[PDB]
Amino acid sequence: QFPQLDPATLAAFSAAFRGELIWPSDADYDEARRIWNGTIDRRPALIARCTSTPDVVAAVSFARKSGLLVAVRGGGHSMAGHSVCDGGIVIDLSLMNSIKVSRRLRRARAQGGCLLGAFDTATQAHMLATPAGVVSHTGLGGLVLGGGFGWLSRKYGLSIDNLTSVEIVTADGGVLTASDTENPDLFWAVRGGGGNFGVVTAFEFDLHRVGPVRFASTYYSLDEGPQVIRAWRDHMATAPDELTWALYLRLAPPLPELPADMHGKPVICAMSCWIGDPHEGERQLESILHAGKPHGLTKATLPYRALQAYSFPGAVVPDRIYTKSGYLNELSDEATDTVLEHAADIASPFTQLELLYLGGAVARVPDDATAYPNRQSPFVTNLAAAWMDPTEDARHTAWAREGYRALAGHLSGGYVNFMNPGEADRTREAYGAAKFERLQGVKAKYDPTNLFRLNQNIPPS
């Protein structure tokens, strides 16, 4: 956190940089360096809060010239802690949050530091939307570069399936456009290849008209887990793209809609929505709500912005997290029993074992069309441990590790955006050999010195 810093380079950077600099002696340093995964505590030499593409160019050049370890930060949600470094520079894009939306063209151009809810607000101003993740304060930047999935994905694909171009600052300080017509090698790689290839200062998306959505959330007792999970797995194998249905095994929240004797006990929280006519939606959801006895059932017809803002209603933001995730091509009865066994052991009220079903529009894109791997595996499991007290890290981490080990033979690949700080070696497996090889060649062209290595990293060559 105290490297040299040639005064002339530094003075060149300062005069070229219009944003804010934050040094270790500054009052806002400690708040500035905190990211969502509170287990990651690192002290950068410097935090540069960029406010424009020229700022990012200055910060990249300054980092390269000074040999500072480069962290890039969009929303700070890295489950691996990638967006803060010890002793280097954080290129922090959090003030670059502008969105321009054309209603006529159904287009959005969004800066690299945007939060999901800010983008959703902007597009919903015109009844428009495009897929992103389900928690409003996640960053658009990291989420999109890894792929990006949420409520609209079965219908409209990953975030990267609606991305048409990026403005990107490469390690040599160049500003490039990448799209289907301009640097398409780079455009393939940023659709899935993370922050490996440079800093994206603007993303352009095609939008869709999305009016109110019929939604339901309910809880089932763990008693009924086998029949609920079998009903879910079997229904989704043939469900219309319009239906999304996700299971979250957790301790029941102390909420008035739930009976007192369920509070704090493991349950299955099922959330579902219908993207399309809300009357059809009401019939479709009613037909999946009764696979177990529903408790705490909430049904609403929501603007899409409000469905985006809904996940997940709790009283405190978890400070500490640890995740282990993989895909499955199929969810066998043995895998289902394992999931339920490990959910009965959840300790924290903030922990969830997520069972997600993608497929739909995500699976109809050709494997090779982007860097995102595993389109053909429909199931995603995520053992997402979350808690508050740092003296309990081992008990929570052990829960995620042991549930994963017990499943791992059934799992393949892994979403880069769900990797934990210890999973740097999962990168080849996540991508597979063919994608990994093509990603390396693009890395050798655009970032041959690996200036961008705080990511699920692809070494060049």
Ligand X SMILES: Cc1cc2nc3c(=O)[nH]c(=O)nc-3n(C[C@H](O)[C@H](O)[C@H](O)COP(=O)(O)OP(=O)(O)OC[C@H]3O[C@@H](n4cnc5c(N)ncnc54)[C@H](O)[C@@H]3O)c2cc1C
**Per CB under 6 A, 157 contacts ligand X:** no
Choosing from 316, 394, 433, 461, the residue that interacts with its own copies (CB under 8 A) is 316
Of 357, 348, 356, the closest CA to residue 322 belongs to: 348
Stretch that binds ligand X, among 39-47, 148-156, 249-257, 430-438 (CB under 6 A): 148-156
**Residue 46, SS3?**
strand
Question: Which of ligand X, its own copies, none has residue 31 at its interface (CB below 5 to 8 Å by kind)?
Answer: its own copies
Number of residues that bind its own copies (CB under 8 A): 55
C-alpha–C-alpha distance, residues 292 and 290, integer Å: 5
Helix, strand, coil tally for the chain in percent (to 5):
35, 25, 40
Residue nearer to its own copies on the CB measure, 299 or 401: 299
Half-sphere exposure of 241 (CA within 13 A, CB side): 12
Question: Which of its own copies, ligand X, none has residue 199 at its interface (CB below 5 to 8 Å by kind)?
Answer: ligand X
Choosing from 85, 135, 267, 339, the residue that interacts with ligand X (CB under 6 A) is 135
**Residue 278, SS3?**
helix
Residue 83 marked in a binding site:
yes
Residue 113 marked in a binding site:
no
**Per CB under 6 A, 318 contacts ligand X:** no
Choosing from 150, 276, 281, 360, the residue that interacts with ligand X (CB under 6 A) is 150
247 dihedral zone (left: phi>0; alpha: psi -120 to 50; beta): beta
Question: Binders of its own copies among 283-302, rule CB under 8 A?
Answer: 298-302
Tokens of 220: 């089932």
Sort 186 into a burial class: Cβ within 10 Å, 0-12 / 13-18 / 19+: buried
Choosing from 47, 58, 128, 134, the residue that interacts with ligand X (CB under 6 A) is 134
What spatial distance separates the first Cα and last Cα of the chain, rounded to whole Å? 31
Choosing from 44, 88, 117, 146, the residue that interacts with ligand X (CB under 6 A) is 146
Q: Mask of contacts with ligand X, 89-118, x by CB under 6 A? A: ----x------------------x------
**Per CB under 8 A, 282 contacts its own copies:** yes
β-sheet bridge partners, residue 356: 380
Beta strand 295-302 with 266-274: parallel, antiparallel or unpaired?
A: unpaired
Stretch that binds ligand X, among 2-10, 135-143, 213-221, 430-438 (CB under 6 A): 135-143
User: Residue 430 — φ and ψ, nearest 5°?
Assistant: -60, -50
Beta strand 70-73 with 89-92: parallel, antiparallel or unpaired?
A: parallel
Please report, for residues 52, 360, 385, 413, the alpha-carbon distance to residue 409 in angstroms, rounded to integers and kept in the order given. Answer: 46, 25, 21, 11
Residue 134 marked in a binding site:
yes
Q: Minimum distance between the CB of residue 427 and ligand X, rounded to whole angstroms? A: 12
CB of 245 closer than 8 Å to CB of 288: yes
Stretch that binds ligand X, among 20-28, 72-80, 242-250, 329-337 (CB under 6 A): 72-80
Please report, for residues 257, 396, 455, the alpha-carbon distance to residue 418 in angstroms, rounded to integers and kept in the order given. Answer: 31, 17, 12
| Locus of tokens 């455009």 | 187
**Per CB under 6 A, 142 contacts ligand X:** yes
Residues that bind its own copies (CB under 8 A): 18, 28, 31, 51-52, 94-100, 102-104, 115-118, 120-122, 124-127, 136-137, 211-212, 214, 255-257, 278-279, 281-282, 298-306, 308-310, 313-317
Residues that bind ligand X (CB under 6 A): 35-36, 72-79, 82-83, 93, 112, 133-135, 138-139, 141-143, 145-146, 148-150, 194-195, 199-200, 417, 454-455
Give the annotated binding-site residues.
Answer: 72, 74-78, 83, 112, 134, 139, 142-143, 149, 200, 415, 417, 454
Give the annotated binding-site residues for FAD.
Answer: 72, 74-78, 83, 112, 134, 139, 142-143, 149, 200, 415, 417, 454
